[PDB]
Amino acid sequence: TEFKAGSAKKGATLFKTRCLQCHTVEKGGPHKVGPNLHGIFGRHSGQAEGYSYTDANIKKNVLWDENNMSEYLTNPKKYIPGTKMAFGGLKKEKDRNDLITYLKKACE
Amino acid sequence: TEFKAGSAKKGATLFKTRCLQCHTVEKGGPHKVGPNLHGIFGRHSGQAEGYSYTDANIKKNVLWDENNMSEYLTNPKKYIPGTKMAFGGLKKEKDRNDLITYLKKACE
Amino acid sequence: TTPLVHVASVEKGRSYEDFQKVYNAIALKLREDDEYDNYIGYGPVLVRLAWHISGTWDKHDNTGGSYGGTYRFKKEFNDPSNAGLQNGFKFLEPIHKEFPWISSGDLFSLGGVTAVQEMQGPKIPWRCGRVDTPEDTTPDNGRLPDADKDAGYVRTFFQRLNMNDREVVALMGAHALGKTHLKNSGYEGPGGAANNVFTNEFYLNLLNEDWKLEKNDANNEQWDSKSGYMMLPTDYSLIQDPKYLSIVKEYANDQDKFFKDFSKAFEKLLENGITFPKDAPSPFIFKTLEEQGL
Amino acid sequence: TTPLVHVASVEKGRSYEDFQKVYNAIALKLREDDEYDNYIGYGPVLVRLAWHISGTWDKHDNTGGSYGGTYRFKKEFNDPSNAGLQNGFKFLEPIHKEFPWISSGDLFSLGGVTAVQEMQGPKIPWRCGRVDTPEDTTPDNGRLPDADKDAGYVRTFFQRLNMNDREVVALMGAHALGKTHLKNSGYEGPGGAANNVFTNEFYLNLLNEDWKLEKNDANNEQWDSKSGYMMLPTDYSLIQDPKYLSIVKEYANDQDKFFKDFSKAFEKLLENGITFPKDAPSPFIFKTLEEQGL
Numbered sequence: 189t190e191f192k193a194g195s196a197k198k199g200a201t202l203f204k205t206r207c208l209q210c211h212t213v214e215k216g217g218p219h220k221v222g223p224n225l226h227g228i229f230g231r232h233s234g235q236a237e238g239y240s241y242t243d244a245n246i247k248k249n250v251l252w253d254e255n256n257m258s259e260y261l262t263n264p265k266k267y268i269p270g271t272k273m274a275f276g277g278l279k280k281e282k283d284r285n286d287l288i289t290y291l292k293k294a295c296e
Numbered sequence: 297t298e299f300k301a302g303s304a305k306k307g308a309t310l311f312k313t314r315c316l317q318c319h320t321v322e323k324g325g326p327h328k329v330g331p332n333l334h335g336i337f338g339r340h341s342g343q344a345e346g347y348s349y350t351d352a353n354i355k356k357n358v359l360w361d362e363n364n365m366s367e368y369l370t371n372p373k374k375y376i377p378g379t380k381m382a383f384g385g386l387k388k389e390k391d392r393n394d395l396i397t398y399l400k401k402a403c404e
Numbered sequence: 405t406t407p408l409v410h411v412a413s414v415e416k417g418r419s420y421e422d423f424q425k426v427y428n429a430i431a432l433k434l435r436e437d438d439e440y441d442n443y444i445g446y447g448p449v450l451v452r453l454a455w456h457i458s459g460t461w462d463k464h465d466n467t468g469g470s471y472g473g474t475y476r477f478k479k480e481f482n483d484p485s486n487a488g489l490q491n492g493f494k495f496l497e498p499i500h501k502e503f504p505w506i507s508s509g510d511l512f513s514l515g516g517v518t519a520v521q522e523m524q525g526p527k528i529p530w531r532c533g534r535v536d537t538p539e540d541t542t543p544d545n546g547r548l549p550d551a552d553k554d555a556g557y558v559r560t561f562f563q564r565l566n567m568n569d570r571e572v573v574a575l576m577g578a579h580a581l582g583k584t585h586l587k588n589s590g591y592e593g594p595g596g597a598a599n600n601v602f603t604n605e606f607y608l609n610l611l612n613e614d615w616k617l618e619k620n621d622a623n624n625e626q627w628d629s630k631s632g633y634m635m636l637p638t639d640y641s642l643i644q645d646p647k648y649l650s651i652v653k654e655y656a657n658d659q660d661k662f663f664k665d666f667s668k669a670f671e672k673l674l675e676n677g678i679t680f681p682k683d684a685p686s687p688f689i690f691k692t693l694e695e696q697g698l
Numbered sequence: 699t700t701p702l703v704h705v706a707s708v709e710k711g712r713s714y715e716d717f718q719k720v721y722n723a724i725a726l727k728l729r730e731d732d733e734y735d736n737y738i739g740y741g742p743v744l745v746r747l748a749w750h751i752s753g754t755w756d757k758h759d760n761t762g763g764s765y766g767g768t769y770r771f772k773k774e775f776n777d778p779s780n781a782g783l784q785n786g787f788k789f790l791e792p793i794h795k796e797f798p799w800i801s802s803g804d805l806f807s808l809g810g811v812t813a814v815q816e817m818q819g820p821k822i823p824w825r826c827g828r829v830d831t832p833e834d835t836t837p838d839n840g841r842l843p844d845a846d847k848d849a850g851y852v853r854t855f856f857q858r859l860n861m862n863d864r865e866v867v868a869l870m871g872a873h874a875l876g877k878t879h880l881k882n883s884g885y886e887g888p889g890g891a892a893n894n895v896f897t898n899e900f901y902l903n904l905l906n907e908d909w910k911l912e913k914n915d916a917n918n919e920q921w922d923s924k925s926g927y928m929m930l931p932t933d934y935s936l937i938q939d940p941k942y943l944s945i946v947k948e949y950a951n952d953q954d955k956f957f958k959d960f961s962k963a964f965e966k967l968l969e970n971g972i973t974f975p976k977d978a979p980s981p982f983i984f985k986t987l988e989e990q991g992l
């Protein structure tokens with residue numbers, strides 16, 4: 189893809205620091221602030237069962253893939269107005285490459 | 297020390313890319329477009345024999361501080377207006393971290 | 405003979421655009437070194453650094469504050485309760501070498517303003533004119549608050565900063581940022597799930613979470629929750645005092661109200677002890693890196 | 699009925715500051731991804747990109763140019779001449795995603811403009827209004843020059859671009875940037891020591907360095923130097939042409955002259971085929987990151 193692949197070992201380092209506090213990637217894992225990310229790729233925005241999202245995540249309605257995910261992580265509040273997630277955003281391309289690569293395998 | 301050390305291997309790969317074309321770190325090595333840098337630390341600006349520095353380089357006349365010489369690589373225009381060295385500059389601390397470390401040992 | 409007077413004198417030939425560049429230098433370095441403190445960033449420690457130097461102010465004799473920018477000397481950066489702020493200091497030093505003209509006071513205070521804005525916080529008006537003073541003007545130890553204390557000590561301390569209940573509760577919203585480092589202050593853990601983003605989570609977590617008083621590995625006592633968060637005693641006292649509680653409850657519902665109150669209270673904190681001339685320019689409102697396209 | 703007319707229509711409600719923000723995004727990514735092509739950067743490939751899409755123009759029927767601009771769809775992306783320019787497109791698409799309002803043609807040319815300035819080149823006035831165009835008008839392959847050729851071929855080719863002797867020598871100065879990749883064009887090596895900074899080294903090395911005609915690993919003959927430099931036959935033909943030789947030695951002694959001549963020439967290039975209405979705003983001169991403290 190136009191969005192390359194990086195180290196999944198470095199991506200986990202990014203996920204443990206910048207993600208794990210709000211999310212969990214294991215199958216049947218617990219939600220915390222944000223919805224569980226297992227099987228997020230190839231899924232709809234905000235369809236995770238049992239938890240309350242904002243009106244934004246539905247009325248955007250994008251299939252999560254390696255491209256728009258990268259677009260969503262650079263400026264979370266630019267891509268989807270009204271989103272709950274409070275995140276500085278990943279401003280470095282390699283950081284997005286590594287993290288999504290880790291997310292690629294972890295949410296399988 | 298006011299400036300922390302970095303890796304000598306990554307600085308080598310950065311030296312053989314952004315430097316080696318213009319520069320040699322060997323003792324008694326030939327100048328190319330730029331002067332030979334052997335014994336750069338513990339020596340002031342532009343005393344290397346055989347190379348022609350524009351007077352601007354012979355002007356400032358400062359010992360290369362760790363700590364200065366690394367601030368050189370920030371913007372090789374500002375520090376000494378009118379220099380002949382054409383370089384984009386190192387805008388990342390991790391770059392000068394690895395480079396100035398490699399530029400120590402190989403300068404023996 | 406009156407308490408000493410600190411008049412704000414703008415740096416020679418310096419204007420808005422010059423200070424906007426200093427902002428950009430700090431705002432870039434924040435994005436640049438993002439690995440600090442497990443990817444929290446230098447943002448929170450720069451907000452505390454601006455608070456720490458401005459928290460030395462005494463309204464009675466007009467001693468201390470951000471004016472002198474005397475935070476650089478052995479007396480005041482080696483204290484017990486400033487531990488960890490050296491990182492914020494080393495952060496602004498390469499930037500000050502870039503702009504040797506700017507005063508230490510204006511640099512530190514701006515560094516606090518910059519951090520808050522880039523963390524997606526409210527716009528904070530910032531004024532220049534702070535003047536560096538000789539080392540004889542350096543204040544003494546213990547003019548900053550103790551973390552193990554109650555609501556009474558908090559209200560009492562902030563009176564010396566001329567801060568009322570409204571302003572102090574707003575200012576405490578900043579403790580949603582960063583964390584406590586056991587190696588530094590003797591407390592451990594963050595206050596919420598967003599450390600590097602400016603939000604009202606502080607007030608939300610305070611009354612929403614279930615808090616238990618426990619002991620850390622420094623033997624100090626802090627309020628911990630099942631979610632892994634923490635609260636200092638001085639922080640937990642805000643829901644203990646009924647007057648503090650209503651304002652806590654309000655900011656939890658209205659984040660916009662919290663932003664506007666914080667901005668005024670934070671600016672006032674940074675501007676405490678400064679006498680601004682009539683010919684002084686209006687307060688600068690700096691553009692975020694997000695508004696400049698970055 | 700006559701050649702086509704391409705009218706520049708400014709994107710709805712867009713001004714200079716909007717395009718300045720797009721400039722910044724590109725310029726920051728120039729700053730950020732520096733590891734490309736052994737730390738040369740995306741600079742040379744972006745200015746070649748803006749050239750290659752503007753080099754498709756034919757003054758006779760007014761086909762091609764940056765109005766479309768001729769890049770953005772499938773077939774001609776695959777030309778034998780444009781191999782390696784896919785990295786330029788990959789660079790600009792994430793920027794186009796956060797700026798979907800700007801047209802592809804205005805983005806490609808601005809990429810070329812931004813790359814030159816951030817490489818410490820001259821200020822290049824850039825004008826918006828380029829409008830997206832359907833795939834049915836999509837100029838073919840072989841409308842761009844061949845590197846193995848002589849001076850006469852170059853003069854003849856650039857007549858189609860409305861370029862004269864002085865204008866082509868100025869444009870050729872951009873070949874001091876980056877290198878040739880054997881994998882791509884069948885040629886290998888740089889033209890000088892400084893690849894990622896804009897300079898007159900192209901002209902200096904041209905008449906100073908000792909050149910040898912040598913076969914590369916692609917069995918293509920190029921002019922190689924002892925310092926490890928190289929020149930395309932088309933580049934070397936500039937000192938093979940006496941009238942070209944005069945302009946080459948001029949830019950060698952005077953860099954400022956070349957910087958000003960390139961500015962007009964390069965601005966003319968991306969603007970070829972565009973008819974600007976009289977109400978159209980004056981050409982933008984964007985500020986570099988360095989000017990903004992970035």
Ligand code: HEC
Nearest residue numbers: 314315318329330341342349350353379380381382891892
């Ligand atoms: C890493 C990318 C680089 C490092 C580290 C240094 N350079 Fe260069 N160099 C070049 C020239 C033409 C000069 C002359 C300077 C002048 O006349 O003002 C220099 C000089 C230096 C110096 C200072 C030496 C002195 O006596 O003042 C240092 C410390 C140095 N260089 C380190 C040539 C080039 C060049 C050509 C394109 C490049 C890419 C670099 N240098 C890069 C580096």
Ligand code: HEC
Nearest residue numbers: 206207210221222223234241242245271272273274275597
């Ligand atoms: C704290 C709060 C965070 C942090 C630091 C991150 N996320 Fe996660 N996130 C959070 C919330 C409250 C929501 C719901 C927002 C809404 O409903 O609109 C989300 C949502 C996401 C999504 C969308 C998918 C989904 O709705 O299930 C993704 C893809 C996502 N978050 C990923 C993600 C990544 C990769 C993070 C770190 C790099 C990250 N978030 C941080 C809560 C929070």
Ligand code: HEC
Nearest residue numbers: 448449452455488549550551575578582583584585588589
């Ligand atoms: C307007 C801002 C602000 C005010 C006012 C403020 N703080 Fe904080 N403080 C912060 C921020 C932000 C941090 C986190 C810094 C970091 O993580 O590097 C912090 C951290 C701390 C820490 C832990 C530092 C460490 O590294 O462990 C202590 C202790 C502390 N503050 C004490 C206090 C006390 C006591 C008060 C008032 C009674 C107070 N501060 C008022 C912003 C503030």
Ligand code: HEC
Nearest residue numbers: 742743746749782843844845869872876877878879882883
């Ligand atoms: C104003 C800009 C400009 C003009 C005009 C121009 N070029 Fe170049 N071209 C470039 C730059 C810069 C590169 C280096 C690309 C890189 O290093 O990624 C390049 C690269 C090339 C390459 C090698 C590409 C590769 O990846 O190996 C060829 C071949 C080439 N150009 C042909 C030509 C010919 C033939 C002409 C004219 C007769 C010409 N170009 C005119 C800017 C220009």
